[PDB]
Design a protein around this ligand. Structure first.
Ligand SMILES: [Mn+2]
Ligand SMILES: [Mn+2]
Ligand SMILES: [Mn+2]
Ligand SMILES: [Mn+2]
Ligand SMILES: [Mn+2]
Ligand SMILES: [Mn+2]
Ligand SMILES: [Mn+2]
Length: 204
DNA sequence: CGGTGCAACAAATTGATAAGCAATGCTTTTTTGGC
DNA sequence: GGCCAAAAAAGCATT
DNA sequence: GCTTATCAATTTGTTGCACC
């Protein structure tokens, strides 16, 4: 129960036959690079499905129509893996994990009245080291926002005196930014095996 | 290529609970690039 | 697309 | 071990992107 970058490119390849696999493969790598770049240096404001497609056009010389179907399928395939209970591991970027959470005490932050947090399965993203280095090294760029999938942004870490957990020796750590992913509604619903029933949908 | 509309976003409240992380060497998985 | 040895990244330890 | 994230219900303002 684990999907990799290559296993993902393989499924996107056998679903994009009208496109040469090598291009299907080059595409995913360009997307992930465009994505890392955005979070690391940014420069071009928020990243979106359109910017990722335009980029594949410019860069790979792909039809604007194919870059769009691909970008969409790329994230669709990831959702399919997770919804099926599979962990998605994209080397050089990060891993999308599934966690079963038990019910725990909550409340209406405004009123204060206790209201329990139901048990559920969530999608979490663990930034890889390759990526974490780029974001602290570069300094921090823009966010990524893909509706229905999730959004990536940067959270700030204040400087602090840390310890080498092996030796217990103190270490002086500088401020830096770290990537943070937020699963979008579609992905949370599909991945959470506790809501595939008559939904939540009323007006008052 | 450009204008609209609207559900999916971000931010904001509190507080109990769950998850992640500083350094870094050895082990394991993944990818790379030739053939 | 499969093989393969080497390089890179990740996994683990503990994180 | 200490720090950061998770989440509840609900409103106010923003934006990705489907659809003209
Ligand atoms: Mn262009
Ligand atoms: Mn299934
Ligand atoms: Mn955030
Ligand atoms: Mn090589
Ligand atoms: Mn490493
Ligand atoms: Mn252990
Ligand atoms: Mn502990």
């Amino acid at each position: 129960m684990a999907s990799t970058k290559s296993e993902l490119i393989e499924r996107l390849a056998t679903q994009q036959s009208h496109i040469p696999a090598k291009t299907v493969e080059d595409a995913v790598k360009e997307m992930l690079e465009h994505m890392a770049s955005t979070l690391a240096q940014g420069g071009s404001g928020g990243l979106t499905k359109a910017e990722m497609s335009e980029y594949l056009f410019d860069k790979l010389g792909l039809s604007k129509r194919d870059a769009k179907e691909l970008v969409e399928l790329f994230f669709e395939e990831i959702r399919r893996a997770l919804e099926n209970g599979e962990q998605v591991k994209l080397s050089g970027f990060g891993n999308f994990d599934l966690r079963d959470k038990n019910q725990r005490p909550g409340r209406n932050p405004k009123t204060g009245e206790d209201i329990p947090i139901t048990a559920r399965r969530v999608v979490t993203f663990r930034p890889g080291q390759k990526l974490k280095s780029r974001v602290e090294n570069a300094g921090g760029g823009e966010r990524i926002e893909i509706r229905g999938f999730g959004s990536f942004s940067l959270h700030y870490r204040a400087p602090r005196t840390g310890r080498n957990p092996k030796t217990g020796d103190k270490v002086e750590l500088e401020g830096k930014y770290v990537p943070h992913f937020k699963p979008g509604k579609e992905l949370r619903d599909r991945a959470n095996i506790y809501g595939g029933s008559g939904h939540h949908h009323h007006h008052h």
